[PDB]
Amino acid sequence: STTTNSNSIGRPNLVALTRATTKLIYSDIVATQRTNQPVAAFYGIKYLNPDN
Amino acid sequence: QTAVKSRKLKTGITVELAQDLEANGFDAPNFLEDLLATEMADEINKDILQSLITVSKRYKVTGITDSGFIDLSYASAPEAGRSLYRMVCEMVSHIQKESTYTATFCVASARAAAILAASGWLKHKPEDDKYLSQNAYGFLANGLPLYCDTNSPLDYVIVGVVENIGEKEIVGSIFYAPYTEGLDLDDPEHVGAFKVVVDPESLQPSIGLLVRYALSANPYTVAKDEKEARIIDGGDMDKMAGRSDLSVLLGVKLPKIII
Amino acid sequence: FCVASARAAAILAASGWLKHKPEDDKYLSQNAYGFLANGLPLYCDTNSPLDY
Amino acid sequence: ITVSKRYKVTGITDSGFIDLSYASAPEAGRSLYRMVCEMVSHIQKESTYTAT
Amino acid sequence: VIVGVVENIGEKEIVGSIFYAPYTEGLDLDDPEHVGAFKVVVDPESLQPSIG
Amino acid sequence: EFTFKTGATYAGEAGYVDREQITELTEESKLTLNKGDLFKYNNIVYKVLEDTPFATIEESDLELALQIAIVLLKVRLFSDAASTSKFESSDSEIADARFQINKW
Amino acid sequence: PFATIEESDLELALQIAIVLLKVRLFSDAASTSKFESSDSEIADARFQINKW
């Protein structure tokens, strides 16, 4: 009565990988613009009443 | 005006491990260069998301939101659920009151977002086929996309604005602005190059990765005790902490989850 | 039309029934906090000290 | 059933599961819906997947 | 009420609770979706067929 | 630990080797911090903005009281980018990236 | 089990345990060695038809 117990298995099949990466949300939460110098300066120009 | 800062990572592997990696299914030279990119991106979000926390002005009201943040309870209907949605909307107007902008995004903790979603009015996909761009919990009745955090240890809610009118006029809380121009790069979205060394004592190679970005607050956010000044460095968080306009934080107090 | 101050127009939106884009592709013309379910567009004041 | 990790909060969902009552409006049914939203969010905080 | 996740990004990366994963590769089958073969014996004491 | 689980940043001004010298938050060490000096908790490193934090905050639990300070601007998360001089002095502990594969 | 479970009703107390991981539903496929020993009581499938 040769069952499966007599047989010996081999390579277990690699069914599926599994990585864990967070939903990296920064392309939408903040506004990006590449800077072509080591120091980046943003101009804040304001409009003022005659009382500043 | 703010000078950029640098982030660096180095992993290193042994040739023996790389040799069997190919024999085990993966592509070691290609897989390894992917790991750093995932790591660096995963760290940048921990920087940007936790930069809004240390920049956004707290929004407090006398009646309930006093002492810093609003406390919710599971009992009695979506009454608690819709209460947060009210505090979300008031933060939008307060942005428009002072920063005159439309507040086109909202960020909250994973647990904090569910109660915001529990109030209804959180259809998964937007009615209008706008940017959507996935990466969002829902889209709210106000039309503001909602983004899940899962990282910041706060149980907070943050509302801010991102706008690029065009040409050079790009305005939004936390400016990021990576610095790689002038450097030989492939696929300019890479933002930084790699580097291999192979130390001499052993011979196992190592891989390095360098990234530079500005990550400064938006203007009209002068630091307290400085007020009248016109050279304000918007990079140092210690000066911009709380002294911002284009983003309002709101924590949530909830019972602890048993483990 | 319906006009309200910023703080007041928020609790009005907080009551639900304030979908951003109007149900019909009508005039809209932007410049509106919302469009309400009754059909009245809502316009944000941000100037008057009234909360009306 | 036998694999899924129990999700218990302190105030209400202690002892492993939550009890509801027919009385007083959807104030009971919607309480369950909040727990469904929390469970979905609790998955992404620890498993980072979308819970579809 | 149970909330889980099913994701099959593509290629071989497949992630989800309870993987099932039936095993029929190699066996002579009619259409790959049958998942399991039948059999008929007809015992000798009686003559009634039986299907397994 | 999993990157997404912690939320702490190791590549940057915080570093990893630098975390050894950073004072660990205790129930006793809370009433010593000042402006400047850093402090870490569960591998997440913060710096203190206003002198003597955890004084107006009367919450008994350590973890919750730390979370109170985040909103109250008393302390601030130190997840931040390193200054350019950190990785060019020939004595530079650069953060490491690690992985491991388990088979089910 | 059923020691920390104070519920008097047998059915509910059993249902209490399943959420507290004490007991476990035993719906589970048999090991391969069970249906090979030349002495295997395979389950039966029965059908009945009644006319209205």
Curated annotation (Swiss-Prot), chain D:
Proteolytic cleavage at the N-terminus by the prohead core protein protease gives rise to the mature capsid vertex protein. Signal peptide: none annotated. Capsid protein that self-associates to form pentons, building the capsid in association with hexamers of the major capsid protein and one dodecamer of the portal protein. The capsid vertex protein self-associates to form 11 pentons, building the T=13 laevo capsid in association with 160 hexamers of the major capsid protein. Homopentamer. Interacts with the portal protein. Interacts with the major capsid protein that forms 160 hexamers. Belongs to the Tevenvirinae capsid vertex family. This is Capsid vertex protein. It comes from Enterobacteria phage T4. The lineage of its organism: Viruses, Duplodnaviria, Heunggongvirae, Uroviricota, Caudoviricetes.
Curated annotation (Swiss-Prot), chain G:
Proteolytic cleavage at the N-terminus by the prohead core protein protease gives rise to the mature capsid vertex protein. Coiled coil: none annotated. Homopentamer. Interacts with the portal protein. Interacts with the major capsid protein that forms 160 hexamers. Capsid protein that self-associates to form pentons, building the capsid in association with hexamers of the major capsid protein and one dodecamer of the portal protein. The capsid vertex protein self-associates to form 11 pentons, building the T=13 laevo capsid in association with 160 hexamers of the major capsid protein. Belongs to the Tevenvirinae capsid vertex family. This is Capsid vertex protein. It comes from Enterobacteria phage T4 (Bacteriophage T4). The lineage of its organism: Viruses, Duplodnaviria, Heunggongvirae, Uroviricota, Caudoviricetes. The gene is 24.
